[PDB]
């Protein structure tokens, strides 16, 4: 028979501190081992757990995975999630003479922003660039950043930085363009942003 490995959800966004559940199913129960991995962007895979076909579970740290071989299922439980858990999580099984990987769960664990202070700032032009650059920053993690209506305005998704020695984390998104009918006042107009967002006078 043909092995098929299915993982759900495809993507999971959750607030830090919450427990998480990652599901893996396989249609051919004749496996030797099941393994869970994480993968960060720009990197290879890191083995988290290997469950032998004769075992029902394995634990390391905050991770616990069950295996129900006859049912064709494994569940990875991640307790008390942390931002450093953000990664793609892959389920694989080892069959008699083949190896098969699921398509993954992309996990994003969002920081709790203690004191949101949403604002859109204009960065200084560079003497060596022709772009105008705007920064939407310090919004809480429930805010969604959309793409522009304009194909020549570029907007990134929210990225979390951690100023470690200040115990401070913040979200931001960057917008830029080299078109002339473009201003920071209007850059994020296609996003639902906080009504109290600070727009400094240019």
């Amino acid at each position: 028979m043909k092995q098929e490995v299915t993982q759900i959800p495809a993507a999971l966004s959750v607030p830090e501190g919450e427990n998480l559940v990652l599901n893996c199913s396989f249609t051919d129960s004749a496996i030797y081992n099941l393994q869970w991995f994480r993968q960060d962007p720009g990197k290879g895979l890191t083995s988290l757990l290997l469950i032998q076909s004769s075992q029902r579970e394995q634990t390391s740290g905050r991770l616990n995975a069950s295996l129900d071989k006859s049912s064709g299922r494994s569940t990875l439980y991640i307790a008390a999630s942390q931002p450093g858990d953000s990664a793609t999580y892959l389920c694989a099984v080892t069959n008699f003479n083949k190896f098969y990987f699921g398509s993954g769960t992309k996990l994003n664990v969002k920081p709790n922003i203690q004191n949101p202070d949403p604002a859109v700032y204009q960065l200084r032009d560079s003497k060596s660039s022709d772009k105008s650059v705007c920064l939407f920053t310090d919004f809480d993690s429930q805010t969604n950043v959309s793409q522009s209506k304009d194909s020549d305005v570029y907007i990134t998704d929210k990225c979390v930085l951690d100023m470690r020695s200040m115990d401070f984390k913040s979200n931001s998104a960057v917008a830029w363009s080299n078109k002339s009918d473009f201003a920071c006042a209007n850059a994020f107009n296609n996003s639902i942003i906080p009504e109290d967002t600070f727009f400094p006078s240019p």
Partner: protein, 244 residues
């Protein structure tokens, strides 16, 4: 201190029809070496496993994908008659015994297959200094670095403050944005942020550098365009702190 799984080369750009050979050295004491192709469109797919110099298991790839293993457990794979869809991260994994011991992965060889080397461009890199309003409102100062117009997506962006690589206060986008999302060999853009205290930014002795390593053409690639040959290179931009 102990070496992990190593892979060489890191990055390759080839035209259609060419061939490549990739190498992997397992962790010392591992004897099972496995290769996998990871693409956005098909995910991670098994190529083949070697142990004690012979192929033990194999996937479903056509014969133009081949492998081998030497007596010291190093392994090579080869791909002949390269096609666009062979663009992928080629990952190798070592294990003491793949049947009951964990797989340990390398970081991969990133291969991009393109129709034409004239599609290859290094990044332009710029730094944008912080907003006055940010500094007055928050007592913090965000620098932005933009890397734009590059192809393929073979870049590494890093920040350096007074000559020391920093990760605190940094966030780099996980993936680049396609500058023309509908074209297959569109150029890419990437953004990154470095946030520091206002006090730190206000010291003119502090020096900030955004570094982008771009991995491009070989010295053995022919180049007949007027513009500069897009070889492997570093493109950088910098700033100094500024008082009031």
């Amino acid at each position: 201190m102990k070496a992990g799984v190593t892979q060489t080369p890191r990055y390759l750009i080839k035209t259609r029809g060419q061939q490549v050979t990739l190498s992997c050295s397992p962790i010392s004491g591992h004897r099972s070496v496995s290769w996998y192709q990871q693409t956005p469109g098909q995910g991670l797919q098994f190529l083949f496993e070697y142990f004690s110099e012979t192929q033990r298991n194999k996937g479903n790839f056509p014969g133009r994908f081949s492998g081998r293993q030497f007596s010291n457990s190093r392994s090579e794979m080869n791909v002949s008659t390269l096609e666009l869809g062979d663009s992928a991260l080629y990952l190798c994994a070592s294990s003491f015994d793949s049947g009951n011991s964990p797989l340990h992965f390398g970081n991969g060889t990133r291969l991009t297959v393109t129709e034409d080397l004239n599609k290859v461009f290094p990044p332009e890199v710029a730094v944008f200094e912080p907003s006055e309003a940010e500094i007055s409102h928050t007592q913090k100062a965000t620098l932005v670095c933009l890397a734009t117009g590059f192809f393929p997506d073979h870049v590494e962006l890093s920040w350096w403050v007074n000559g020391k690589e920093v990760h605190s206060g940094v966030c780099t986008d996980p993936q680049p944005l396609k500058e023309q999302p509908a074209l297959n060999d569109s150029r890419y853009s990437l953004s990154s942020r470095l946030r520091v205290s206002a006090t730190f930014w206000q010291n003119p002795r502090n020096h900030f550098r955004c570094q982008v390593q771009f991995y491009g053409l070989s010295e053995n690639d022919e180049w007949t365009q007027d513009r500069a040959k897009p070889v492997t290179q570093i493109v950088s931009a910098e700033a100094w702190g500024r008082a009031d």
